Amino acid sequence: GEYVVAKLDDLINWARRSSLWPMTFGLACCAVEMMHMAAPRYDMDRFGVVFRASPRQSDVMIVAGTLTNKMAPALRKVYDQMPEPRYVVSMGSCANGGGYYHYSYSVVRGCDRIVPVDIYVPGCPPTAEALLYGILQLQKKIKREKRLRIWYRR
Amino acid sequence: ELLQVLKRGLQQVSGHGGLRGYLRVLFRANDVRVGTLVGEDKYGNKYYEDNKQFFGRHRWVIYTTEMNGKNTFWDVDGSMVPPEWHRWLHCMTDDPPTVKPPTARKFIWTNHKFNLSGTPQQYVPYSTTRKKIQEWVPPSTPYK
Amino acid sequence: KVKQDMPPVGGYGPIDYKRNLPRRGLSGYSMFAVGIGALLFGYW
Amino acid sequence: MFMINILMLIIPILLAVAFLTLVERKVLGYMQLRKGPNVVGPYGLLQPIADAIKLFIKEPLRPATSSASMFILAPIMALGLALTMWIPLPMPYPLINMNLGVLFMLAMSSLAVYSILWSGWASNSKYALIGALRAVAQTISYEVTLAIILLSVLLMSGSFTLSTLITTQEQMWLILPAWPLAMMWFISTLAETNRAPFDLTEGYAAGPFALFFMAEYANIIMMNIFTAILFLGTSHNPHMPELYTINFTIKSLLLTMSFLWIRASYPRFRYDQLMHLLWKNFLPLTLALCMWHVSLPILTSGIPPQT
Amino acid sequence: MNLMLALLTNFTLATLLVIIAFWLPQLNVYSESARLPFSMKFFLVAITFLLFDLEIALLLPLPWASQTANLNTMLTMALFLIILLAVSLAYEWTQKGLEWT
Amino acid sequence: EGYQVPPGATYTAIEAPKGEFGVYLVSDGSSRPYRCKIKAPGFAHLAGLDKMSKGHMLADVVAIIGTQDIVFGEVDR
Amino acid sequence: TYKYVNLREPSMDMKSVTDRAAQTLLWTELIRGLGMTLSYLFREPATINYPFEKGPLSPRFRGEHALRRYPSGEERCIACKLCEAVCPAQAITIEAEPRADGSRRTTRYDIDMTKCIYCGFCQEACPVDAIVEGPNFEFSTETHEELLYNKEKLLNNGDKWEAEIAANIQADYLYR
Ligand SMILES: CCCCCCCCCCCCCCCCCC(=O)OC[C@H](COP(=O)(O)OCCN)OC(=O)CCCCCCCCCCCCCCCCC
Ligand SMILES: CCCCCCCCCCCCO[C@@H]1O[C@H](CO)[C@@H](O[C@H]2O[C@H](CO)[C@@H](O)[C@H](O)[C@H]2O)[C@H](O)[C@H]1O
Ligand SMILES: N=C(N)NC(=N)NCCc1ccc(I)c(Cl)c1
Ligand code: SF4
Ligand code: SF4
Ligand code: SF4
């Protein structure tokens, strides 16, 4: 039976990582490099990552830019609306830890104070390629999941 | 010309060593182009070029199937490219390390490591300074 | 001898910038004529 | 035997819809100087399978406190009606040979607007209800011209039987005598299926969303098969029926691609602007061409036979 | 009976896909009528569609009617009906019934 | 430390792609600016959206925002 | 000097009016736009095959930081704190003391890579080429903590990447 569960886990993992539909929170300059990842040279859609998805149809949230205090409740509301399984990719220094604005009165010092984060992409901004590296790193993280294996040992 | 186009498509099957080799690269790299082998690194990554392709597609690497004890037949990473080939592959230079080798230093890593995040080899930060204030240690003998 | 990025001696060749949207197709008269001709052949 | 026949229509319809999602993404990709899906399976061939699996094992959220009776009834009606639209299609033989097949398709599609209406009610959100009521108004409005155009074409065919359209076009495609009608029919199917540049809704989750998407793309392929039959009739040889199926399938594919080609090429209408396109442009012309096509067979002595 | 089987199969498979879509395993063990502010213009579109739809119902028999021997009467009434549809549209048009501003 | 700037205040502007982009820079004589007001052209343009959208439809507001060329990095600073 | 972008009068002859009517009723300019997307369908796409192919970069590229050595293996950094002073993000933290051989060396050299703006000012300010931004840009992590670099991490980056870093410096140092 362990052979069947291991194969079933592999199938659902393959489907979920082969079909990552992102909801992009294009908050600032990091959104532009996200655009260049959707652009022809890198074509994120060729990996099965559609260009744009509504929050209720998205599998991954990409926080691409500075998260201010005024914005934080809105971002948390959208995260709570995502169907599961859901993942968060934090892109750029601002989202990772506040970046250039870490010491400002109006900025959240890292989006991981508001939502759990799966992947941190460094850079100000990360290059389009660097973000793509992070997405492919998220895929490998999903490939490691063993949800059904852990379910049947409960 | 459609026959020349189809002949070239057939020549890719033979250029990759037959049907099996053609299918392996098709499924590993989603690409069946045949280039000129520029060199191979000590980890097994192979580097190819075809200057008739447009800038950006004129150089590529076919990653090794195993690197530092990790099966990489399907799990390939951009960080598997070692630094000496990294420069060539990103077009920071024209000359591969087979033509212009890097300068040797005793302290340079002999073995490249890829991204180790998420594994037991991941970096964990810590303070590198020693304790600043020394506390008084009371005497071990009794005398109140 | 100083060497820095410079244009070639004599400069670069001319660069186009003006809009170039060429005129194509038939006049309105001919387009209606072909359309009406097609209708009459079909009706017949 | 007939149960086999039903399944040999339903199952290919669903697979054709699944792989249209791949073709649309790749055709749009190359029109945009990119590639589209080419990693998940060779040339993206496994992408539709990955997408379908991903969608069905996703958390199936519900609005909660909703007319959930109609949250579930909206996609059942949408998919059930979409699959029902195929049973009279002659390819070259229909699953069900209906005497009034053309009118059966008109009747069934007119019901498809309910799944829009019910889904807006089931959202519990007043702004979603407004969007649904805007989509319904667009859909019923373009139902008007689709019906009148269809009736005009049937005055050259002479019956409501879909397979008679094949007989009518043995010598010549109906697009030649009726290219003005075909132009408005084709644009009407775009606005009817809420396709770009009429995709104003884009101006549900998990499996329920997948079922709404599959119903919509089943209708897109269906309307393009109907277009090919109505205006690009294929010649049917009774002793080699698969020759008909090959040629008619190619025409249907090319028309469906043209839906993707159009999506890649144009901006999006404003709501009032696509309502003015129907009520102030298509409908005035459609009424005039209906009068013309009622008179034309009589004054040429080309009235078609009843039988 | 064939048509019933086709209809029953189509909507039964649709129901099965929708209920299955909701009842797949989740692997979790923890707890889970007024006046709409909608324009009168949309009501008039629906009513306008309904009245034009009724007119289309009357035009549907036209392919059969063209087989009559009494073609002079048939053609006159067909054009009479369509012209009245045209007049209905023109009345809506000139009375600003098709505006959205 | 950086170079010290002689005390004074300037309003300097250029024809940026989005409009007139200026800075009102105040120097107190030290190596750090005393005050730096950034004039972002999109600030005044977005303030005109209500005026410009008068008598238009909902879908037009999307076009009018686009025609103004609005980046909120400069509007909000 | 200026030009008008849209100051024109359509001709009102019959041939011109009939040209515009045909465009209205036959959709000619819409059909023309279809032609252009059709031409792109048959053009070779610009997509590269990442990660087997990489976008081109220059020797000046500002990527992951590293601490460098002299050929002898001695650290270049002499704890001058110019990098810390110039850092626009205050992303660098340094402590220093005399080494056991009397050398002026750091006991702490941290870079918060989530504060850093990857501006390169530190490598401009360094008088001894000790701190550089290397060519690596593929170092995303699964946790925030992994991006808080201490001196050990940064020295290891220098030893890992020196082969490429030295070659890049060799190509650009005459521009500096
Ligand atoms: C011998 C006597 C015979 C008597 C009969 C003679 C009749 C022949 C002469 C009449 C021909 C009429 C042609 C009918 C087509 C519809 C015409 C039409 O309505 O087009 C105008 C419409 C609105 O025009 P607009 O510029 O927006 O505003 C004008 C109002 N002031 O603008 C539009 O509708 C544009 C469409 C918008 C959607 C764009 C996406 C489609 C573009 C690709 C089209 C591909 C072609 C379709 C092929 C279909 C094949 C099945
Ligand atoms: C096309 C048919 C293919 C049939 C394949 C059948 C495979 C059956 C295995 C299903 C695996 C589902 O895996 C599970 O999915 C649900 C959503 O649906 C996720 O979500 C679920 O768990 C999380 C917590 O873990 C909850 O917060 C959530 O509310 C719950 O819905 C789980 O995190 C994921 O572990
Ligand atoms: N709209 C997008 N997000 N892109 C897109 N065209 N996705 C389509 C993905 C899809 C949806 C339903 C099914 I069933 C299948 Cl097989 C595939
Ligand atoms: S991390 Fe840099 S590029 Fe990204 S939003 Fe912040 S300042 Fe802009
Ligand atoms: S690159 Fe700029 S922000 Fe980052 S450590 Fe160097 S000086 Fe500081
Ligand atoms: S890295 Fe360079 S600038 Fe920074 S403290 Fe060391 S020697 Fe000084």
User: Order of SSEs of chain B, N→C?
Assistant: HHEEEEEH
Give the N-terminus to C-terminus distance of chain F in angstroms.
26 Å
* Strands of chain B, total number: 5
- How does the major sheet of chain B shape up? 3 strands, antiparallel
The shape of chain B is elongated
Morphology of chain F: rod-shaped
> How do the SSEs of chain F run, as a string of H and E?
EEEHHHH
Which cofactor or ligand species appear? 1,2-Distearoyl-sn-glycerophosphoethanolamine, dodecyl-beta-D-maltoside, the ligand N=C(N)NC(=N)NCCc1ccc(I)c(Cl)c1, iron/sulfur cluster
Number of helices of chain F: 4
Major sheet description of chain F: 3 strands, antiparallel
Radius of gyration of chain B, whole Å: 25 Å
> What separation lies between the terminal Cα atoms of chain B?
106 Å
Oligomer: part of a larger assembly
Q: What is the number of E strands of chain F?
A: 3
Radius of gyration of chain F: 17 Å
Approximately how much beta-strand content do the residues of chain F carry? Answer: 25-35%
Structural class assignment of chain B: alpha+beta
In percent, how helical is the residue content of chain B?
A: 10-25%
Please bin the fraction of helical residues of chain F. Answer: 25-40%
Provide a compact summary of the structure.
Chain B: InterPro entries: NDUFA12. Chain B: Belongs to the complex I NDUFA12 subunit family. The structure is cut from a larger assembly and holds 7 protein chains of 7 kinds. Chain A is α/β, with parallel strands linked by helices and 154 residues long.
Describe the fold and architecture.
Chain B: Complex I is composed of 45 different subunits. The structure is cut from a larger assembly and holds seven protein chains of seven kinds. With 144 residues, chain B is α+β, with helices and mostly antiparallel strands. Chain B is built from three helices and five strands, in the order ααβββββα. Chain B has helices at 2-15, 19-29, 83-89, and strands spanning 36-40, 46-49, 59-62, 66-67, 70-71. Chain B has a three-stranded antiparallel beta sheet, with no helix packed on it. In chain D, 68% of the residues lie in helices and 0% in strands. Chain D is built from eleven helices and no strands. Chain D has helices at residues 2-31, 47-56, 68-84, 101-111, 113-122, 126-157, 162-168, 179-192, 206-231, 241-263, 271-300. In chain D, α1 (2-31) crosses α2 (47-56) and α1 runs parallel beside α10 (241-263). Chain F is an alpha+beta fold and 77 residues long. Helix content of chain F is 35%, strand content 30%. At the D-G interface, α1 of D face α2 of G. The structure holds 1,2-Distearoyl-sn-glycerophosphoethanolamine, dodecyl-beta-D-maltoside (LMT), the ligand N=C(N)NC(=N)NCCc1ccc(I)c(Cl)c1 and iron/sulfur cluster (3 copies). Dodecyl-beta-D-maltoside sits between chains D (52-53, 56-59) and E (24-28).
